[PDB]
């Protein structure tokens, strides 16, 4: 589903 | 203590009319966990084991995770389950609340039960949503499908209104997941 950039933006 | 410390499995049947004994509320379209309405004593057909208070968050049905889905999807999972229904639920109070935005901002220890559940919930919400970004469209992407391409101005209006359930930043742009449509 989500891209690498999206997941790096939000993951914590 | 853990977000998931009060999680339990309650087992129910549907009544003759095919109803649960309680209403489902909330859902990702409302920016919420699915959660129970009022649970009146006597109204629910339990099998042996744990029982439900009013307004518990519903996490799973027959080992299908439903938190992060819309109410329609939750009802669709339930319609394809055979009795008895095993519901994994957690009562609201303290750190546990039906608001998905607040939940998805919580930071849990990597590998924890709390973290694994949060990832499962995010995966569910991602099945139902197109992300928004303020970065420009690139070759190969389909607007409306891969991303909603919006301005910073627009993104901040959505943040302010609570329409984004999750947001972050990467390489000078904003990224987020809006509430899915109701239907």
Token reading at B167: 């947001």
Neighbouring-strand partners of residue B25: B35
Q: What is the DSSP string of chain B?
A: --TTTT-EEEEEE--TTS--SS-EEE-GGGTB-EEE----TTSSEEPSS----TTPEEEEETTEE-TTS-HHHHHHHHHTPPSSEEEEEE--BTTB-SBHHHHHH----TTSHHHHHHHHHHHHHHHT---EESSPP-TT--BTTTBEE--HHHHHHHHHHT-EEEEEEETTEEEEEEPPP--
CA distances, B110 to each of B1, B70, B100, B163 (Å): 15, 27, 19, 27
B132-133/B148-149 β-pairing? parallel
Query: Per the structure block, which two tokens stand in for B61?
Result: 């049905």
Which structure tokens are listed for B35? 């959660």
Nearest to B166 among A1, A8, A10 (CB): A10
Minimum CA–CA partner of A4 in chain B:
B170
Which residues in chain B are closer than 8 Å to A4, comparing Cβ atoms?
A: none
A8 secondary structure, DSSP code: H
Q: What are B80's strand-pairing partners?
A: none
- Helix (H) or strand (E) segment spanning residue A2: none
Overall resolution, Å? 2.0
Peptide bond into B84 cis (omega under 30): yes
Nearest-5° Cα angle at B90, B119 to B128: 40
Rounded to 5°, the CA angle A8-B128-B142 comes to 70
- Which residue(s) pair with B86 in the sheet? B11
Q: Which of B135, B169, B81 is nearest to A11 (CA)?
A: B169
Bridge partners of B9, per DSSP, are: B88
Which residues on A lie below 8 Å from B107 (Cβ)?
A: 12
* Residues B126, A11: C-beta atoms closer than 8 Å: no
Interface test with A, best of B131, B137, B172 (most A CBs within 10 A): B131
What is the domain class of B132-178 according to CATH?
A: alpha beta
What experiment produced this structure? X-ray
d(CA B2, CA B5): 5
């Amino acid at each position: 589903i989500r891209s690498h950039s999206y997941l790096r933006a939000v993951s914590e | 203590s853990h977000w998931t410390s009060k999680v339990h499995e309650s087992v129910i049947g549907r009544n003759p009319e095919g109803q649960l004994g309680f209403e489902l509320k909330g859902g990702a379209e409302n920016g919420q966990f699915p959660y129970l309405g009022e649970v009146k004593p006597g109204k629910v057909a339990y099998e042996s084991g744990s029982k439900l208070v009013s307004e518990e968050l519903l996490l799973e049905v027959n080992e299908t995770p439903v938190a992060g889905l819309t109410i329609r999807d939750v009802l669709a999972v339930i319609k394809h389950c055979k009795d008895p229904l095993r519901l994994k639920c957690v009562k609201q109070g303290g750190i546990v609340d039906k608001d998905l935005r607040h939940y998805l901002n919580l930071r849990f220890q990597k590998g924890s039960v709390d973290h694994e559940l949060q990832q499962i919930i995010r995966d569910n919400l991602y099945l139902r949503t197109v992300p928004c970004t303020t970065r420009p469209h690139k070759e190969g992407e389909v607007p409306g499908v891969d991303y909603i391409f919006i301005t910073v101005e627009e993104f901040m209006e959505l943040e302010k209104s609570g329409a984004l359930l999750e947001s972050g930043t990467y390489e000078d742009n904003y990224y987020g997941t809006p509430k899915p449509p109701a239907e």
